[PDB]
Every structure is written in structure tokens, then in C-alpha cells.
Write a protein that binds this ligand. Structure first.
Ligand SMILES: [Cl-]
Ligand SMILES: [Cl-]
Ligand SMILES: [Cl-]
Ligand SMILES: [Cl-]
Ligand SMILES: [Cl-]
Ligand SMILES: [Zn+2]
Lengths: 51, 50
């Protein structure tokens, strides 16, 4: 999996299948944060899906 | 919080988010942490999960 990044494209580590876009603050990257506070959260499992 | 529903509703006390999950189309209260998905959208406004 590859994901857009802002905290560029980055390749996630093996096993991290999702990408995410979090708004509270703007973050983009690998994974899908489960514990992190957000206002809008978007996770998707396609390459570069998290704009 | 009030959220659109598909599986239209006021969430229980303390559930602050709404969600729209695609793998399957589900809408409702909360933000599922363990449930499989292809696209997941969670948001913390009334009726934000279309
Ligand atoms: Cl993951
Ligand atoms: Cl992860
Ligand atoms: Cl995860
Ligand atoms: Cl409310
Ligand atoms: Cl409200
Ligand atoms: Zn309200």
C-alpha cells in the first residue's frame, strides 16, 4: 500500500493496509488511527486514496 | 448527536461520531474500530455521514 502523506507519497509497512485523512489539524498517512481524536476521519484501502 | 442510518437516529449518550462504511453500505452512530471496511468515514457533526 502507498498513501499520501502530510504530518508526499509513502509506502506503508507490511500489514498496514489502509490510508487515512484526519481533520480536527490536517494529517495524511498510513493506517487508520483508532485512538486519535478527530473531527472528520477518512480511511481507505486503495493506493493514494486519502486526499 | 444525530446520524443518518442504513443497515434517522439519535445516538446514545456519549457516542459523539457518525459513520459511513463501505466494503456493503452501512450508516449509523459511532465509528467502528474493529469492523472490516474498504472506505470508512467518521465525522462528528449531526447528520454528517452521507
Ligand atoms: Cl491497517
Ligand atoms: Cl496501523
Ligand atoms: Cl488499523
Ligand atoms: Cl446533538
Ligand atoms: Cl449537535
Ligand atoms: Zn446536535
Amino acid at each position: 500500500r502507498i498513501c499520501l502523506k502530510q504530518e508526499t507519497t509513502t509506502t506503508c509497512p507490511e500489514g498496514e493496509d489502509a490510508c487515512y485523512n484526519l481533520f480536527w489539524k490536517i494529517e495524511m498517512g498510513c493506517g487508520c488511527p483508532k485512538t486519535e481524536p478527530y473531527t472528520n476521519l477518512y480511511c481507505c484501502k486503495i493506493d493514494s486514496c486519502n486526499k
